[PDB]
Design a protein around this ligand. Sequence first.
Ligand code: HEM
Ligand SMILES: NC(=[NH2+])NCCC[C@H](N)C(=O)O
Length: 244
Amino acid sequence: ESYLWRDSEVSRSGSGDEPFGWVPEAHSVFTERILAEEPPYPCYFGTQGQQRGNNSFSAVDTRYPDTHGPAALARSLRAYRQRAWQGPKRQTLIVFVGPAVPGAELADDHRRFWTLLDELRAYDTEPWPADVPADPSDPRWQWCFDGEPWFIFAASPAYKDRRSRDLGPCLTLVFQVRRVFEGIGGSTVAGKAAKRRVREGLARYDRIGPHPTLGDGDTSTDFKWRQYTLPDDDSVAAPDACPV
Ligand code: HEM
Ligand SMILES: NC(=[NH2+])NCCC[C@H](N)C(=O)O
C-alpha cells in the first residue's frame, strides 16, 4: 500500500522485473556509501541518521508512471512529512528514481530531477505557502509541498569530482523538513562548528572544494534552487535559469 519504507521494509518494495524490483540493490549501495569507514562519508549527520534508524526511503519507477510515479511519490511525501515532525528531529527521506540508465550524463539526471519536482506540485493537496513566492525566478523561491518549504538535493552517479553526491547508480533525491536543523542553524555557534566539520570531511572525500553557493549561514541565501543541483565544478548558474 504505502511506498514509504524503513530499512527493514525495503526488501518488500519489489523483486525481479516487478515495479521497484531494482530498489533493494539501490538501497544496499546507498547504505554502503554512507556507512563507509575510510574515508568516512563527509556528512556525519547523514551517517549518524542511518546508523540510528532515522532514514526513510521511497522510489519512482519510470516504467510504471501511473502507479509508481509522481502521484504516488506525492502520497509518500505526505506520509513522510507526518513522520518527520514526530520523534527524532534528524530524519531524512531518500528517494531512488530508476531503473538506472547506464551512460546518463549529469545534465540528464538534473533535468529528470527538475521535471519531477515540477510534476509533484500538481499532486499537492495543500495551498502553496503564502509567504514563499511561487515563481521560481524570484530570489526567495524554494520548493514547497504539503504546506511548507523543504530541503532537497539531487544525487547522481554522474558526479565524478563531487563524489559526496554520488550515492549509487540511480538519480536519488534527498528530502528533509526544516526541523533537521534545530540547534544548528547556520548563524549559531553549533551551526558554524557543523559547517567546519562537514567541510573538512568534503576536502577528504571529494576532488573539488565546497561550492560557492553554499553560504556562510549568516543570512537567508537568495536563489536556493542552485544548491539543489550543484555542478561537478565551481561554476555558478544564472540565477534566472531554474528549470521548473
Ligand atoms: C542521508 C542523509 C544525508 C545526506 C546524504 C547528506 C549529504 C550531504 C552532503 C552531500 C553535503 C555536502 C553539501 C552538499 O552537497 O549539498 C551535506 C552537508 C551538510 N549536511 Fe548533510 N546529509 C544528510 C543528512 C543531514 C542531516 C540529517 C543534517 C542535520 C541534522 C545534515 C546537516 C548538514 C550540514 C550542516 C551540512 C554542511 C553545509 C555546509 O557546509 O554549508 N545533513 N550533507
Ligand atoms: N543535507 C544538506 N545538503 N543540506 C543543505 C542545507 C541548505 C541550507 N540550509 C539553505 O536552506 O540555504
